[PDB]
Every structure is written in structure tokens, then in C-alpha cells.
């Protein structure tokens, strides 16, 4: 479970840095919505899942 | 910080200044649009 704690945490930072840059570049981009739109939706979903995973496993490390 | 998070204690030293940079970025942006 500790390996999982370390990689879920390592995924959250990476995903956060990507979302932090990507989400505003896509929102202000032109047609780049047909892409980004659905990719932002579950980028938002997986981010929430990653926060929860890290928070749960934190009590097992 | 709990030792399982000691890996980020360099990142913590920087975090509180991030809001200031937000003030600075609005100038980068207005500079990029020529005010």
C-alpha cells in the first residue's frame, strides 16, 4: 500500500501541474474545445479520485 | 511535516508566495496584450 501511496501522490502533483497549465490554455484557445472539453472533464474526475486515494492511504503509511 | 511527506518540505517553502505571483502574472498578461 505504501508504493501505492507514493505513486498516487506522485500522480496528483504531475496531474495538477498539467491541469494548472492546460485548463486555462484550453479555455482561452479557439476550437480546441472539441478536444480539451472531454479531456478536462475526467482530468477533473481523476484529480478528485487521486486526492481521495492519497488521503485514504495516508493512514496506512 | 510527517516524514512520509518530508520529500516536499522544499516545495512547502515556496508555496505561500504563489498568491503574490498571481498579482505579477496579471502584468505579464497585460504586457502581452499591450495594455
Amino acid at each position: 500500500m505504501t508504493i501505492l501511496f507514493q505513486l498516487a501522490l506522485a500522480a496528483l502533483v504531475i496531474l495538477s501541474f498539467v491541469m494548472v497549465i492546460g485548463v486555462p490554455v484550453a479555455y482561452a484557445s479557439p476550437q480546441d474545445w472539441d478536444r480539451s472539453k472531454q479531456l478536462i472533464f475526467l482530468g477533473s474526475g481523476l484529480w478528485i479520485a487521486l486526492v481521495l486515494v492519497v488521503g485514504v492511504l495516508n493512514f496506512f503509511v | 511535516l510527517p516524514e512520509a511527506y518530508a520529500i516536499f518540505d522544499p516545495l512547502v517553502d515556496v508555496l505561500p508566495v504563489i498568491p503574490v505571483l498571481f498579482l505579477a502574472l496579471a502584468f505579464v498578461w497585460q504586457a502581452a496584450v499591450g495594455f
Partner: peptide, 21 residues
């Protein structure tokens, strides 16, 4: 440093792609 440039990076990418600056 990486967190510092993330800011100006957004303004660069939005000017290369003709974004809504």
C-alpha cells in the same frame, strides 16, 4: 523555478496559438 515559469508559460502558449488574451 518550475512553479515560477508556469505563469508566463500560459501567456506564451496563449500568444503562440492566437488565444483569447
Amino acid at each position: 523555478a518550475m512553479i515560477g515559469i508556469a505563469g508566463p508559460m500560459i501567456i506564451f502558449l496563449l500568444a503562440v496559438r492566437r488565444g483569447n488574451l
